[PDB]
Design a protein around this nucleic acid. Structure first.
Ligand SMILES: [K+]
Ligand SMILES: [K+]
Ligand SMILES: [Mg+2]
Ligand SMILES: [Mg+2]
Ligand SMILES: [Mg+2]
Ligand SMILES: [Mg+2]
Ligand SMILES: [Mg+2]
Ligand SMILES: [Mg+2]
Ligand SMILES: [Mg+2]
Ligand SMILES: [Mg+2]
Ligand SMILES: [Mg+2]
Ligand SMILES: [Mg+2]
Ligand SMILES: [Mg+2]
Ligand SMILES: [Mg+2]
Lengths: 845, 781
DNA sequence: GCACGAAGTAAGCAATTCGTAATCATGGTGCGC
DNA sequence: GCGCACCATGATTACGAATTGCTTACTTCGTGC
DNA sequence: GCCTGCACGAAGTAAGC
DNA sequence: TGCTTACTTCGTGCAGGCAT
DNA sequence: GCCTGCACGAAGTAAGCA
DNA sequence: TGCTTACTTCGTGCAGGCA
């Protein structure tokens, strides 16, 4: 059977204190139950706001009384809930705390504290603090307040409840600047819609387990429990408010019972007196317990696919708390329900499934881990030296210890550049991987770099936004850490003002590179106005697209407006700003302007005949320069060859006068002779190569004078260096001492992207020779083609953007086939193609 | 092997009509299912009032379409639900009606109508009208509207739903003056707390079965179904409103579906389009059906003690309707669940338990009765000649027919003075015992007295309050019936005004006896002011207790105030009204005044020294005068001439010689009771004059009998347990299926008979009581 | 416009560590003296 | 028949690539005459 | 079980033997 | 001139309904 | 973790001076 | 013929959302 028990190890005075506290808590929870009973019995009372306020007041007082249990945090020992010893686990948490209060936040956890206090004064001495729907506080924060015994924070009347502890719970979290991870961010996004969303609903909607959403009740974990724990431990203990609450709550409780007796007369023949409620405790609870059991067995049968018989048995066994079931060891589940399948238990208890179907553990080994650490997130929240201590003392088996260690390491070895040694040293230095990730988000860059082996790659992989800041020239480690701590992240540092960034010791070039305002500061003289434009509009391209009038409004010059939109000199001098800007934004290029508009249209728009001819293509200028073929006739001449000088010298002059309306036949041969006269000069200048000195100039531009002359002295001349660059001879370029990847990537475009994908310089060289540019690799290359070049499937998945489809234990070829048929990677219909939707549904994101 | 089937016997045009109506109902119920799906899936949607309004609108439209099924009430025949032919039963109801609509109010009853109409346009063409929790109407009234096909009454919009059909359902019942019996009165008491209380919850709280709470869907039965049927049939059919609803509902349904598609975007990635809902009907229903099955199997395991396997099998077989399980014959339960015990089936199906453990029926005979009449209340709702016709046609076996007959008669033979012959004649004259009791409640005294054998005792036992009115001198049968029909009951006749009672032809002495205002009319000159005081305060003793100032206000005289409180002449002349009245109400008697007060205190209160000190066998003619006073001169001289003298008559009276007093010709019970005090009460308890004589000799007064005598003591005197329960004031505790010994043990353990009704339910189960009797006495919870 | 820094980054280099392909462990399955 | 040959899958080896630090050797920026 | 409604003996006050 | 029938005024109480 | 939208310099082709 | 601004179209990579 299930074991609920605990023993009292305090003094007799403390014994009387704890008994009085627990009995007042039972009185308060009786009130909770009686108010819900009245709500269920009368349809009029179900709508009464007074009765709901009374119900929430009872919840508040129950929480206050619960917080005062085990104040010295030592009056109880060997607290057992459903057969799990909480004493050992609470000690291993970073914040420690009382095992009594830690137990009472579980379903029917009061049964241990009740036995420890030899309580028999009531029928069911129940105390519960898991209220959700009608709770006047945010439920998780309520439970965490009880776990940490905060009587100062537990309000004793509904009016005293602050909005930052209820619907505006987000305000209280932001007040204390607590590091929040991605999972907690998605959970908060759900909770902002409805703070009273039940936790299993968040788990279902986010595709996590209940254990993943809640987390460990300690600031060093991940989940809503861990998040509130982080927030609460940073709240200083307000002793005066605690004493005031203790003074008020007893007299308040008697007032609530009298208010209920007064209110029950409005709806019943027999008023709900305290005597009546004590003499009917089983009548009140029975309905609520029955609906609990029904909903629990339904969730087990529906969402977890457990047989109706087994699901109903388990709902009966654990008072219908699916949170407690999914954290119960397999042996105990089989003890209370012998027909349970191991597969069903692995279905409901996802920690057991992870320990078996990934770490190949025995059911008993996984039971060890579940009894000691409850969940995987509980293992991650436990210090590594604590696990080694448990293993040395013989309290943990070898298989369980090895599995827990590999679980701890895997949380960090997944990071790029961190292996077993660096993860080992990080865990030694900071205890558990959750704390490591916490220090990473808090931007403790120097604190992390002090560990042996934490270099540039590890910092770029761990500290968010460190890679973006440290890559900027002039910004060193200390400046990056200072900025990230001052503003709160790379995104917040990028949004900072120019003046305050100058105050931090940033050059105008550094700020210009950070914000990307070089193009904007090429127009406006200063950086402040460019940054303000980036604030208002958000993108320089949007500022370019802005109409001429709105650009003139709050603008500086019309020549500046023409420089912004890239208006040609001919187009800006031939027309006004409005018409020229409209033409440029409608056609794009001056050649398209000359092609799709007629000469008469250009004249009507107010262009000089010579200027209107210059707006037209240079073919027009050549035609009129040779023998004045005419502004009216040169257009019809260019209308046949589609504005192409090559097709003009091809066909016979007889075929030329055929298409054009009117053409002199003697002139028809003088224009073909002039067309052939220029295709000999277009070809003479088209096939041209630059000089050796010009290659030297480009090399000095790209890699500086020193490395350029080193390359020139190594090979023949700068012409040979350019020949090797155009052929993508990365291997030969790297042979030169003093030439590395930061020079080759600056010489050969696209080498940096290929090296970032994990490609050997020889592999990047082969790829660049095969496809010629990374853009053509990403769109054109196929996985089999890349395997012909000798690339591993990991590099192929990296370079083709198919990392999502491979992360679900799937191959790269069939992954590319989906990106081939449909447009994107994101695109029931899969059963038509014959796919197992299991992984697609499993990985949500 | 459950049989859900029905055959169509209308025309092809009518066939298309019925098919179109059924398909529109399926559309509406799909809307219901989809709104429920959204509500169960999201906790935020569970609180969305807009989604609830949409859901209730869908429910309303489903009900409206359901009412229009089988309007000619002849388009279907051989309607089979779970293997029961409803055609035969609906015909035997007083109001008849459509077997199609009668079937559709059952769980998965649409499966018979769906087969009758060859419906295949949807995956599960389900139409259900049993909604309870979220139903915008009172659920039982909703179902009774559908069963009677009242399309005029089914609202089509939540805003058009009248309060008299929802939270104020009591108004609609009172509007039509429908006779309500005690079981229906307790059911109404529960429903006033929560009109949407599910019927099995009412069954638990009242300690009844579900069939007892529901009753037959017909005005001549007992239960909430029967009550609403009584109320609905008295509502005239508003044809124009029905046509208006038929006009509106199609476009309203299309607007509801558009509103659902718009609202579903707030909660889902794929909006709930009609196409999506039709192409996913099994996914939507899958969750809801499983929750129904779980609740049903759980209730079967806990409240009925059925094995988990068998309970889950029964819940799955009948789609989780415990009302349907308790009305299913044993053969069907064993067919769908072969491991079911006969004892488990008798636990869940209380009609089967009654037919076996009381009428010694075979399981097959009880199954016969359950197939034909569903429940005991269904047997009581069927005419007796209908049952005899069924027996003559061979449709009912010998054992089943005899059991049904004994059940019908027992409903009337239990009344005092009604035996087998009189019950037989009453059933012949009015068809079924429910109709007999109904006419009794309707105060149809002349209609009942027309039956051969219906005399004074039978009328006093049947017509409520007839015994109280007819006992008043001068009030005959016709006047009693007139008053009971004019005011609505003996209590209402007592509350009537004096002027309107005088207009009916009542003497002032008759009204004074009825209202009990003789003491009040001895103070006030007229009857109207005494009646107004009885209205204001309710009791003459309450008027006596009134303070001196409130009695003086709107009062007449101070001497009258002193006469009311019974103030002695010495106490009223020695002090004023205030102090004397306070002393009299604090001490009671002048002797206590003189004992507990000092002479100096009396002087200080303003009393004269002399007054304060004072405050501090017969002959033959003499006995003959008393005899002339008690029984008149004639009977007195008759008694004197029969015996020795008036002294001998007095000697026999003091010894309670009732037997010898009754020997005298011309001397009856009304004379002996006026001579021997307490004889009237003992005769009214059903005691032989010899038995009353023995009791009066043994204890000396009825007051000392009621407090001192024990049931064994009275059984030593030779009294039947019925007479013992009558005479000891335990008639309440015995009428609740308890014996007289345990009734006296309850009056002994707990203080009074009233004090047993406020005891803990745990201590009553400790005494070995069933929740039926516990609910009769106090009531769960 | 160019001297002339003034920090700051690119490159090298040895030792260590990462990390993924190569191989080993292990449990089946099929062709032959 | 009893061994070995060839797979098949997951686990573990193993060795080339990347990383960690530390130290020069140039490289943009950027003032001032 | 409260409530209406006479009964009746007790007892203090007077007329009559 | 002092003891009896006689007769109100209390004070207490049972009986008979009716309602649960 | 993909994806659109920028930033921004690269680069191939010609007029403008030189 | 040759050295610069001048207009065109990419191609290279970083960042910010969103599921
Ligand atoms: K290293
Ligand atoms: K190996
Ligand atoms: Mg403290
Ligand atoms: Mg050891
Ligand atoms: Mg890694
Ligand atoms: Mg630590
Ligand atoms: Mg370091
Ligand atoms: Mg930098
Ligand atoms: Mg090199
Ligand atoms: Mg026959
Ligand atoms: Mg009888
Ligand atoms: Mg009839
Ligand atoms: Mg008669
Ligand atoms: Mg009469």
């Amino acid at each position: 059977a299930l074991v609920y028990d605990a023993e009292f190890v305090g003094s007799e005075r403390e014994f009387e204190e704890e008994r009085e506290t627990f009995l007042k808590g039972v009185k308060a929870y009786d009130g909770v139950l009686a108010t819900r009973y009245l709500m269920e019995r009368s349809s009029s009372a179900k709508n009464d706001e007074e009765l709901l306020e009374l119900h929430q007041n009872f919840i508040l007082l129950t929480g206050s009384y619960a917080c005062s249990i085990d104040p010295t945090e030592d009056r109880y020992q060997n607290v057992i809930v459903r057969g799990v010893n909480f004493d050992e686990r609470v000690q291993r948490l970073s914040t420690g705390g009382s095992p009594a209060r830690y137990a009472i936040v579980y379903r029917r956890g009061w049964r241990a504290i009740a036995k420890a206090l030899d309580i028999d004064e009531e029928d069911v001495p129940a105390i519960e603090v898991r209220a959700v729907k009608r709770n006047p506080l945010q439920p998780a924060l309520y439970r965490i307040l009880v776990r940490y015994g905060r009587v100062d924070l537990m309000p004793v009347t509904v009016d005293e409840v602050p909005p930052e502890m209820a619907g505006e719970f987000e305000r209280l979290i932001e007040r204390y600047d607590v590091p929040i991870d991605e999972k907690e961010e998605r959970i908060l996004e759900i909770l902002r819609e409805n703070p009273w969303t039940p936790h299993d609903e968040i788990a279902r909607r986010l595709g996590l387990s209940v254990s993943e959403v809640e987390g460990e009740k300690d600031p060093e974990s991940s989940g809503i429990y861990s998040l509130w724990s982080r927030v609460v431990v940073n709240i200083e203990y307000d002793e005066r408010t605690a004493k005031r609450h203790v003074k008020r709550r007893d007299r308040l409780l008697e007032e609530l019972y009298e208010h209920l007796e007064e209110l029950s007369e409005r709806y019943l023949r027999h008023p709900l007196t305290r005597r009546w409620i004590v003499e009917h405790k089983r009548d009140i609870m029975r309905r609520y317990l029955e609906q609990r059991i029904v909903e629990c067995a339904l969730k087990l049968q529906d969402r977890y696919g457990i047989r109706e018989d087994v699901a109903l048995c388990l709902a009966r066994a654990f008072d219908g708390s699916i949170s407690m079931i999914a954290t119960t060891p397999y042996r105990t589940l089989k003890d209370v329900c012998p027909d349970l399948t191991l597969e069903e238990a692995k279905s409901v208890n996802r920690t057991l499934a992870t320990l078996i179907d990934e770490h190949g553990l025995s059911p008993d080994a996984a039971d060890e881990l579940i009894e000691h650490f409850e969940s995987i997130a509980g293992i991650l929240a436990t210090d590594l030296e604590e696990i080694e201590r448990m293993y040395e003392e013989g309290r943990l088996s070898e298989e369980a210890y090895r599995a827990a260690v590999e679980i701890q390491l895997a949380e960090l070895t997944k990071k790029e550049g961190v292996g077993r040694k660096t993860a080992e040293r990080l865990l030694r230095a900071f205890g558990n991987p959750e704390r490591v990730k916490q220090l990473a988000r808090e931007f403790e860059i120097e604190k992390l770099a002090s560990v042996e082996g934490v270099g540039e790659r590890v910092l770029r992989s761990l500290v968010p936004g460190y890679a973006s800041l440290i890559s900027i020239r002039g910004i060193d480690r200390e400046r990056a850490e200072r900025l990230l701590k001052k503003y709160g992240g790379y995104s917040k540092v990028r949004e900072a003002g120019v003046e305050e960034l100058r105050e931090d010791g940033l050059t105008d070039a550094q700020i210009r590179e950070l914000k990307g305002l070089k193009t904007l500061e090429s127009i406006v003289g200063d950086l402040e106005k460019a940054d303000e434009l980036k604030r208002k509009y958000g993108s320089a391209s949007a500022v370019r697209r802005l109409p001429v009038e709105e650009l003139r409004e709050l603008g500086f010059s019309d020549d500046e407006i023409a420089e912004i939109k890239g208006i040609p000199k001919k187009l800006r001098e031939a027309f006004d700003l409005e018409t020229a800007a409209e033409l440029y934004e409608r056609y794009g290029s001056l050649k398209e302007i000359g092609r799709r508009l007629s000469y008469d249209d250009l004249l009507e728009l107010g262009a000089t005949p010579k200027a209107a001819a210059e707006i037209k293509g240079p073919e027009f200028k050549f035609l009129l320069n040779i023998e004045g073929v005419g502004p009216k006739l040169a257009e019809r001449i260019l209308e046949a060859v589609d504005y192409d000088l090559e097709r003009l010298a091809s066909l016979n002059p007889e075929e030329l006068a055929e298409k054009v309306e009117g053409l002199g036949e003697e002139l028809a041969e003088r224009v073909v002779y002039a067309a052939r006269e220029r295709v000999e000069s277009r070809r003479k200048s088209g096939r041209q190569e630059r000089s050796e000195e010009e290659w030297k100039e480009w090399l000095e531009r790209k890699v500086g004078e020193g490395r350029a002359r080193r390359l020139i002295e190594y090979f023949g001349s700068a012409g040979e260096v350019g020949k090797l660059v155009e052929n993508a001879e990365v291997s030969k370029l790297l042979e030169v001492p003093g030439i590395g990847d930061e020079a080759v990537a600056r010489l050969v475009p696209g080498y940096k992207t290929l090296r970032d994908a994990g490609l050997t310089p020889a592999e990047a060289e082969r790829v660049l020779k095969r496809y010629g540019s990374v853009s053509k690799v990403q769109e054109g290359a196929t996985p089999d083609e890349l395997r012909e070049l000798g690339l591993g499937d990991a590099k192929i998945a990296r370079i083709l953007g198919l990392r999502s489809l491979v992360n679900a234990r799937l191959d790269v070829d069939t992954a590319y086939e989906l990106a081939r048929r449909y447009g994107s990677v994101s695109a029931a219909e899969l059963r038509e193609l014959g796919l197992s939707d299991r992984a697609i549904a499993r990985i949500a994101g």
